[PDB]
Design a protein around this nucleic acid. Structure first.
Lengths: 68, 76
DNA sequence: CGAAATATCTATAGATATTTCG
DNA sequence: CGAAATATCTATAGATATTTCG
């Protein structure tokens, strides 16, 4: 539980709920690709929106990005 | 064998160490970007995410291989 | 099947804060 | 001093390759 989730695991968890990164981005008024940017770099707002969709805290998906 | 473990556990340079090493050579990320026809901020993007070309240009400026600055990004 | 989403490598920029330089 | 460079959080997009979905 100290390791960041793999990007494939985050995507799989969203898809199981009937949610896509693209759809979730569009639903929040962002460009389709914007939330997927959080898969490759630290982006607090995008992380918060993704975590919210999974009923999780962003620090539990990406503990290494929230060390401090 | 001993060589292979050491590759496997190598860690990425801290961004401050990369910047310090460039500056000691009289090079800035901004200057280096502009010198290659890129926007001033573009090479600094490699400090926050995997960007192979930017990594290559930065490593070249330090006389290094990008996989020695960012071993964790070049782990296959 | 084709459409859409994801993965990757490509390159970008506005606002704000801080540090370093000329 | 103001300019320039770096750091962070904000959000973006063209193209190719691959995977997943309806």
């Amino acid at each position: 539980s100290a390791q960041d989730w793999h990007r494939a695991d985050i995507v799989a968890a969203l898809h199981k709920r009937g949610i896509t990164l693209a759809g979730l981005s569009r639903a929040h008024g962002l460009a389709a690709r914007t939330l997927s940017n959080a898969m490759e770099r630290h982006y607090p707002r995008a992380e918060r929106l993704i975590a919210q969709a999974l009923d999780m805290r962003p620090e539990d998906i990406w503990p290494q990005r929230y060390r401090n």
